[PDB]
């Protein structure tokens, strides 16, 4: 992909393809509410990261216009306010306030660097993005079950990773301290760099905990033992052993240096931690602190939080911000996820249906079911 054909390929995009009615369709949100969709916030960042926040508009024709008219590189959406964003400048301080927005997750590969070995910061391959795969599922389904949300988008970032919006009515009206503390519910993996150590267990296992775990032991043989190898020698296996008791590391390391891969030394890692326990619960704590994810806290808590637009257009990879299937979730590839110029080129090889003679369709196709059962919740 080359980054030098973006900015004719975001006319194109943004005039014949950009689903402009599902956008509308899901931010006014049946129109229930008045100057809903008005009263929102959204930010471009165009050419030369010109950025620019506080933009509202009137309805989705002003948003076809002005998108169109702008192109921008960057969309960001954010949150409802009490006032028009356009008219802030006009707005007394002290008046001018964040009233609802969706509640959002921000899951980022770059935050596993710590105990991923294929790849750092923003490079991703297959044998690290099982790590998304156990984060979608192990997050969506606390917020489904745990905390009946039951309008859940999930998107792709365009390269590193996935957002979350949770759309449903109820929680578009938290509170910052509620947000704060679903945030701290879902949240196990704790410290910055100076702590090695980033997860430790009370003797009882809260639900969300074993549910999550239970899990992590479904994808944990074939992501860390095989295809990441996280004992495949003493460099990588001392961190391991970093999370452990000392009194165990003799006996590790010996069985460690006799054995031939890592799902040997995982099985020995078992025995030696099960015995500890009797005279705790390290296995899991070992396994939560490599595949368990990370969250800001402050992507989550404020409602004035700007996050990446569905739909959007990574400005390096050119991948589109698409949905992912829930039910297809294991079988999603970032790396075959359509390009711009991939949907350009489809375009020009052939009024309101373009995009489903696209690869675009199905991921529209998933945004349109999520919100259609956003209308069956609105009616009955
Ligand atoms: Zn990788």
Known sequence: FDPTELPELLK???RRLFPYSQYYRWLNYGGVIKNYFQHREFSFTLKDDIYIRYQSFNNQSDLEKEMQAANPYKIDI?????HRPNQHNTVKLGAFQAQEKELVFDIDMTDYDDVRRCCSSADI??????????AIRIIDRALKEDFGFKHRLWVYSGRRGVHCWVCDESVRKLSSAVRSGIVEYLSLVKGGQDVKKKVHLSEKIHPFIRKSINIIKKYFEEYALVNQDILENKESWDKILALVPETIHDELQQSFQKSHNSLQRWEHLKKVASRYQNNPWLEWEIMLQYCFPRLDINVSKGINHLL????????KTGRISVPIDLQKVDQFDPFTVPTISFIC????????RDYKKTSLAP???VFEHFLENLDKSRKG
């Open 308 to 315: 990446k637009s569905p739909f959007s257009v990574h400005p």
């Open 363 to 365: 991921y529209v196709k």
């Open 345 to 352: 080129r489809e375009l020009d090889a052939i009024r309101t």
């Open 12 to 14: 194109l995009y943004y």
């Open 125 to 134: 391959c297959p044998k690290c993005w099982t790590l998304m795969t156990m």
């Open 78 to 82: 954010g949150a409802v306010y009490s």
